[PDB]
Design a protein around this ligand. Structure first.
Ligand SMILES: COc1ccc(C2=NN(C3CCN(c4nc(N)nc5sccc45)CC3)C(=O)[C@@H]3CC=CC[C@H]23)cc1OC
Ligand SMILES: [Mg+2]
Length: 330
């Protein structure tokens, strides 16, 4: 009657780590009754004063968040609400990096966080190539182009039309158009087929880096501003190997479960089994070292250069984890 239950109090204590890399997100999922995305989003919105800035009624925010979280599939091992919550929270920490202090507007911040929250929504647990090759409805709907990522956007935005779900109801049309475009640009950039171009552009930006007289980055056009936000959410999406090993390993188990399940479906149907998806011919450990060497380390090393030296502990953790996995390959 006015005061928190005890479970709620334990949850609130865990949520004091919301500004830290290494938040116990799985623990938060258990303590919130499988509402990690709702509670983490709500905490971040309060912390960054987004409800007041964007005149978001609190009941509307909570209704939307619960609705959004309910459209992540609980029967999907990796691409579920816990992953969404993790990417949100990691984006939130990245946005607070000292090298970006006062760089981004409140609308850009809103965009990056909202994008993170909706980015994998209604994910079926299989890849774009799988959807294309099976002639699935999603693939037909999006003419085989960034199928899943188009769908995540569409669902994220459509859910705003459910009863008391329109969290953007008080924004002007100009704010809504700008928000929408940024969100679209960010989520589409989460398709791994875009990774090499995103990284090439991030490298170019590091090579031509300009800093303000405060020492933070100078980003004076939309293209550079959106590029940084796109890479930031992409870093968050690829942040698992940079976390404390206990967290990383859980993510690895989850992604492997998801991939192996896809592989079983491919094998059942006589399709070629996708990379890392064959449980009879897999090395989990070699796959992780490969993932780090070819994808995650080149990205995070370049991000670390951009924000030097803010990401040094993250990069050190990544390199330790890489060595750990390497040492378990027989
Ligand atoms: C915890 O461990 C993981 C978490 C997530 C993933 C994902 N992986 N990929 C792709 C990455 C490239 N992939 C590779 N393929 C091949 N042949 N070689 C290689 S070497 C280098 C990789 C690689 C395919 C999957 C996705 O698109 C997911 C959706 C969005 C972002 C990342 C997600 C992966 C994890 O661990 C492997
Ligand atoms: Mg995705």
């Amino acid at each position: 009657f006015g005061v928190k239950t005890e479970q709620e109090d334990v949850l609130a204590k865990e949520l004091e780590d919301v500004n830290k890399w290494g938040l116990h997100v799985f623990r938060i999922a258990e303590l919130s009754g499988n509402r990690p995305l709702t509670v983490i989003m709500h905490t971040i919105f309060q912390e960054r004063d987004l409800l007041k800035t964007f005149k978001i009624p609190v009941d509307t925010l909570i209704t939307y968040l619960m609705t959004l979280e309910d459209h992540y599939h609980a029967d999907v091992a990796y691409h579920n609400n816990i992953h969404a919550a993790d990417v949100v929270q990691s984006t939130h920490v990245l946005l607070s990096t000292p090298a970006l202090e006062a760089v981004f507007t409140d609308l850009e911040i809103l965009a990056a966080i909202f994008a993170s929250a909706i980015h994998d929504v209604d994910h079926p647990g299989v890849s774009n190539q799988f959807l294309i090759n099976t002639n699935s409805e999603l693939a037909l709907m999006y003419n085989d182009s960034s199928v899943l990522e188009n769908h995540h956007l569409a669902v994220g935005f459509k859910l705003l039309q459910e009863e008391n779900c329109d969290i953007f109801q008080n924004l002007t049309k100009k704010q809504r158009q700008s928000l929408r475009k940024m969100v679209i640009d960010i989520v589409l950039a989460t398709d791994m087929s875009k990774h090499m171009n995103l990284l090439a552009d991030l490298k170019t930006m590091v090579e031509t880096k300009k800093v303000t007289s405060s020492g933070v980055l100078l980003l004076d056009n939309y293209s550079d501003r959106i590029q940084v936000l796109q890479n930031m959410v992409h870093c968050a999406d690829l942040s698992n190997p940079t976390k404390p090993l206990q967290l990383y390993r859980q993510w690895t188990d989850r992604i492997m479960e998801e991939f192996f399940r896809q592989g079983d479906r491919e094998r059942e149907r006589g399709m070629e089994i996708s990379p890392m998806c064959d449980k009879h011919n897999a090395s989990v450990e070699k796959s992780q070292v490969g993932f780090i060497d070819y994808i995650v380390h080149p990205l995070w090393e370049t991000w670390a250069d951009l924000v030097h030296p803010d990401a040094q502990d993250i990069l050190d953790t990544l390199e330790d984890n890489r060595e750990w996995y390497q040492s378990t390959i027989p």
